Design an enzyme around this catalytic site. Structure first.
Site, PDB file in Angstrom:
ATOM      1  N   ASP A   1       6.183  -4.515  -0.761  1.00  0.00           N
ATOM      2  CA  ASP A   1       7.147  -5.606  -0.865  1.00  0.00           C
ATOM      3  C   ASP A   1       6.845  -6.571   0.278  1.00  0.00           C
ATOM      4  O   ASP A   1       7.162  -6.288   1.436  1.00  0.00           O
ATOM      5  CB  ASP A   1       8.585  -5.087  -0.798  1.00  0.00           C
ATOM      6  CG  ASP A   1       8.904  -4.080  -1.903  1.00  0.00           C
ATOM      7  OD1 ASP A   1       7.962  -3.590  -2.558  1.00  0.00           O
ATOM      8  OD2 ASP A   1      10.101  -3.778  -2.124  1.00  0.00           O
TER       9      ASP A   1
ATOM     10  N   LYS B   1      11.748 -10.251  -5.666  1.00  0.00           N
ATOM     11  CA  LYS B   1      12.768  -9.512  -4.938  1.00  0.00           C
ATOM     12  C   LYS B   1      13.642 -10.503  -4.181  1.00  0.00           C
ATOM     13  O   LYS B   1      13.130 -11.449  -3.577  1.00  0.00           O
ATOM     14  CB  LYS B   1      12.112  -8.499  -3.969  1.00  0.00           C
ATOM     15  CG  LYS B   1      13.067  -7.534  -3.277  1.00  0.00           C
ATOM     16  CD  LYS B   1      12.317  -6.555  -2.374  1.00  0.00           C
ATOM     17  CE  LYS B   1      13.265  -5.824  -1.431  1.00  0.00           C
ATOM     18  NZ  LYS B   1      12.559  -5.193  -0.280  1.00  0.00           N
TER      19      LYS B   1
ATOM     20  N   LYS C   1      13.943  -7.394  -8.756  1.00  0.00           N
ATOM     21  CA  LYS C   1      14.555  -6.388  -7.901  1.00  0.00           C
ATOM     22  C   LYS C   1      15.699  -7.007  -7.115  1.00  0.00           C
ATOM     23  O   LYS C   1      15.526  -8.051  -6.475  1.00  0.00           O
ATOM     24  CB  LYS C   1      13.524  -5.776  -6.948  1.00  0.00           C
ATOM     25  CG  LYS C   1      14.094  -4.735  -6.000  1.00  0.00           C
ATOM     26  CD  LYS C   1      13.006  -4.131  -5.126  1.00  0.00           C
ATOM     27  CE  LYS C   1      13.595  -3.182  -4.081  1.00  0.00           C
ATOM     28  NZ  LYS C   1      12.554  -2.624  -3.173  1.00  0.00           N
TER      29      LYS C   1
END
Lengths: 224, 216
Positions: free
Chosen positions: A92, A155, A184
């Site tokens: 990430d 994300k 996400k």
């Protein structure tokens, strides 16, 4: 079955003062509830990969250029392959927010592509756009550069900024990427109710720290 | 006189290009010791300050969590120096120190120091707000053993900032061999002077202009 929300949760612990025993507990909880992954800082990747060596369904997730995203693409790529060499199969990364606000889109995409290329065929990439610092147009622009760069995921938040995930932004990001990339929700997701709200708005993964209490709310919603 | 000890700092995630320009021009105007910027801005700050060699380009290594590998901390240090940095402020592995894993804490600092060897000064941020009193002393001792040039209070992203008691404790460990940098929470001139009396050699602050105009 009626899929447990556990399979969508990235067990996450990223505090600067996290110790080895806490990583041991986090990996054991993930093996127990079969979380989607554990998310640890790069220094703990090797330990988590060993603790979860016999848990293939639980990935080792780490964070790249985290949480400020204000380093160079070459550093983000080196950290990515270094993490992958240490046993991480998901990464990430944090976009270059300042470059995005200055509309230097070529570098924002170049920055993401550096991580994507380093992870190609070895790790899933999630692009943290840090929604709390972006305007509405910059949220969509960042998701579009993630799609073009070949990332696997967008994300919301690092959890170290001014806000976390909101259902309006998850809907906003799901609209841009469509079905092609995952979405996400992270930061601020405290209860099963919040997690269900993000899932309803289009989220396919949840970054949280209370994952044990969230799943324990799933077994406790049908209790007598 | 106070300006030559201030690292004019801006490390915000959403810092834009025009604010790095404003930061460098203030550093030239007030002749600050350096500008502290995130690694993405090192190349630009070095070009904006080419005609001002007295002010250095300082960046942050493994910032602000310090929870990445020594390998990438070294890569980021070598990368920053290639982009024009001459001072680097790194964050220790706090979890390793709390775990009494002193060989990894030491090796992590030597990774940066060896990368900077002969090219850049190394400041070791120990993050005083998350450490016991003994862990503060131990971190400063590993910094001297690894060849760091400085010891720094805080990242500005955790518990608290520089306190006069912490500066005197770190100055007591390093003696005169290493500088001691006070950073985080110093807004006025009064705080800046309070840290220096405690033994601080450099000040990291956002409002270096507000501090300097207190004496002028």
């Amino acid at each position: 079955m009626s899929r447990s929300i556990a399979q969508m949760i990235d067990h996450t612990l990223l505090k600067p003062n996290t110790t080895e025993d806490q990583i041991v507990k986090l990996c054991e909880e993930a093996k127990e509830y079969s979380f989607a992954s554990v998310c640890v800082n790069p220094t703990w990747v090797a330990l988590a990969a060993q603790l979860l060596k016999d848990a293939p369904d639980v990935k080792v997730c780490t964070v790249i250029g985290f949480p400020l995203g204000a380093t160079t693409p070459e550093v983000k790529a080196f950290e990515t392959t270094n993490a992958i060499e240490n046993g991480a199969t998901e990464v990430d990364m944090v976009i270059n927010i300042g470059a995005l606000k200055d509309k230097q889109y070529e570098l924002v995409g170049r920055d993401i592509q550096a991580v994507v290329k380093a992870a190609e065929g070895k790790a899933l990439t999630k692009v943290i756009i840090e929604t709390s610092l972006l305007t509405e147009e910059e949220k969509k622009a960042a998701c579009e550069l993630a799609v073009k760069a070949g990332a696997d995921f967008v994300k919301t938040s690092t959890g170290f900024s001014g806000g976390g995930a909101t259902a309006e932004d998850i809907a906003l990001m799901r609209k841009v990427v469509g079905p092609n990339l995952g979405v996400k929700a992270s930061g601020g997701v405290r209860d099963l109710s919040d997690a269900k709200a993000m899932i309803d708005a289009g989220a396919t993964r949840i970054g949280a720290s209370a994952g044990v209490a969230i799943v324990n709310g799933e077994r406790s919603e049908g209790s007598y």
